[PDB]
Amino acid sequence: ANRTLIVTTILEEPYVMYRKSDKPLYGNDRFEGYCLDLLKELSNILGFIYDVKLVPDGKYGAQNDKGEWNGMVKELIDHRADLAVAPLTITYVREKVIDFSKPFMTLGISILYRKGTPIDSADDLAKQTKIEYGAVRDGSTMTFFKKSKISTYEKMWAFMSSRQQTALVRNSDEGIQRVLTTDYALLMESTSIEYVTQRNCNLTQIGGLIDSKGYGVGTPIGSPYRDKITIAILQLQEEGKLHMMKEKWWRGNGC
Numbered sequence: 104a105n106r107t108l109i110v111t112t113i114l115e116e117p118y119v120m121y122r123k124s125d126k127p128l129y130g131n132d133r134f135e136g137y138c139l140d141l142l143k144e145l146s147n148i149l150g151f152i153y154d155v156k157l158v159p160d161g162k163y164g165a166q167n168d169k170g171e172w173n174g175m176v177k178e179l180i181d182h183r184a185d186l187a188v189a190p191l192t193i194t195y196v197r198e199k200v201i202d203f204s205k206p207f208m209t210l211g212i213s214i215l216y217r218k219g220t221p222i223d224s225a226d227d228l229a230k231q232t233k234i235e236y237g238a239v240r241d242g243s244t245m246t247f248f249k250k251s252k253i254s255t256y257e258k259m260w261a262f263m264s265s266r267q268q269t270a271l272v273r274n275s276d277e278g279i280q281r282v283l284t285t286d287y288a289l290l291m292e293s294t295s296i297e298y299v300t301q302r303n304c305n306l307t308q309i310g311g312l313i314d315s316k317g318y319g320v321g322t323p324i325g326s327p328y329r330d331k332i333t334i335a336i337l338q339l340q341e342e343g344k345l346h347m348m349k350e351k352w353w354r355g356n357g358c
């Protein structure tokens with residue numbers, strides 16, 4: 104408990120954001136959000152100090168054809184970060200190469216679209232071509248479709264990848280702008296959809312959850328921190344703190 108832990112993260116509202124201030128902010132103070140509040144709580148419970156670095160390449164983490172990982176996942180593999188604290192989705196393929204705490208938040212893939220249409224499910228998207236749909240390129244949602252053996256999701260992946268230049272987007276902001284200004288539905292995690300729909304009363308989640316998973320803190324395989332982090336997350340849940348943090352960043356208060 105002396106060396107400063109390096110934490111890798113990624114910009115994604117309301118998890119991780121640049122704090123605004125009339126005066127200059129330095130180091131960790133530049134960042135705010137649900138995950139920064141979480142990290143602070145974890146650091147208090149476990150008694151460590153930390154240095155927040157964005158993932159250099161700006162990516163969550165995916166495998167290329169040669170099987171090579173990038174993004175926050177690779178930062179951990181290569182021991183360039185001690186922890187990843189982000190909306191980092193716990194997946195089977197990632198568990199092969201990094202360890203995750205128990206989840207601090209649960210979510211599933213769902214659909215962000217506008218209100219007032221006859222679209223009620225992924226099946227409604229899949230059976231037509233007029234409304235475009237896609238996902239953020241190279242994250243867990245995209246990979247879910249790429250790897251699905253379910254007929255509907257296979258059809259959807261065929262659509263997304265055949266029209267990849269338009270259907271797949273670079274980040275959440277691009278995807279939301281597409282929903283706002285074109286006839287487009289974004290495949291998106293339910294937690295992130297909820298943030299958006301609270302802030303724009305024209306937008307809605309369409310249908311239910313397409314899968315069921317969690318965000319967890321990532322560590323390099325074998326890290327002693329992983330189980331300690333799980334214990335801390337369990338404590339925060341027990342204390343009602345995870346609920347309070349969600350309400351602070353999704354609803355409003357407090358503050």
Ligand SMILES: N[C@@H](C[C@]1(C(=O)O)C[C@H]2OC[C@@H](O)[C@@H](O)[C@H]2O1)C(=O)O
Binds near residue numbers: 190275292
């Ligand atoms: N959390 C995902 C990344 C991503 C997704 O693939 O869904 C990218 C971006 O997509 C929109 C929304 O789901 C947000 O939480 C982000 O999650 C991951 O860990 O790969």
